[PDB]
Each structure stands twice: as C-alpha cells, then as structure tokens.
Amino acid sequence: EYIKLKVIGQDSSEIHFKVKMTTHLKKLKESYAQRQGVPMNSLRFLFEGQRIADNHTPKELGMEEEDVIEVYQEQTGG
C-alpha cells in the first residue's frame, strides 16, 4: 500500500520515494538531503506550497500516488 511521491529540487531534478500513508515524512526529508549531500535543515520541503513537518504523514496531508513535493532552500537556513 505504498504511494510514490516525486520530490523536485531547485534545479528541476527528481527523486521518487515509495512511502506508506503512515510514514513520518522526516524519513523522506532525511533521505533526500543525504542524497543531495546537504544538511537536512538547509532545506524546506513543501506540498502545495505548505511546509512539511517531520511528523506529518502522507495521510495527514491528503497526499496520493504521483503527488509532488518541492524542495527549496530554507529561508533562514536553517
């Protein structure tokens, strides 16, 4: 019962993540930052423009298969 989320970076690159509806999104943020080789707190992760918290889950955010997460530099970063 995974959904696949597409994570889009500042440079238009994509990394997809298969997650459960109950997965704490901290797991995704940490993995993504690791693969980019930057500290996790230098980034902010947005779903439809709203900030994804470590303890948010896809269910709480109303996410579904194929949904996009955008990654921006943290604004006081961070």
């Binding site: 995974y2 696949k4 993540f17 298969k18 459960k20 797991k27 993995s31």
Partner: peptide
Amino acid sequence: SGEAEERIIVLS
C-alpha cells in the same frame, strides 16, 4: 547534459 535516469527509493 543528458536526461537523468529514474530514481526510486523505498522507505520501508
């Protein structure tokens, strides 16, 4: 440069 390959990470 070329198109990146597909990248899927499973968070189990």
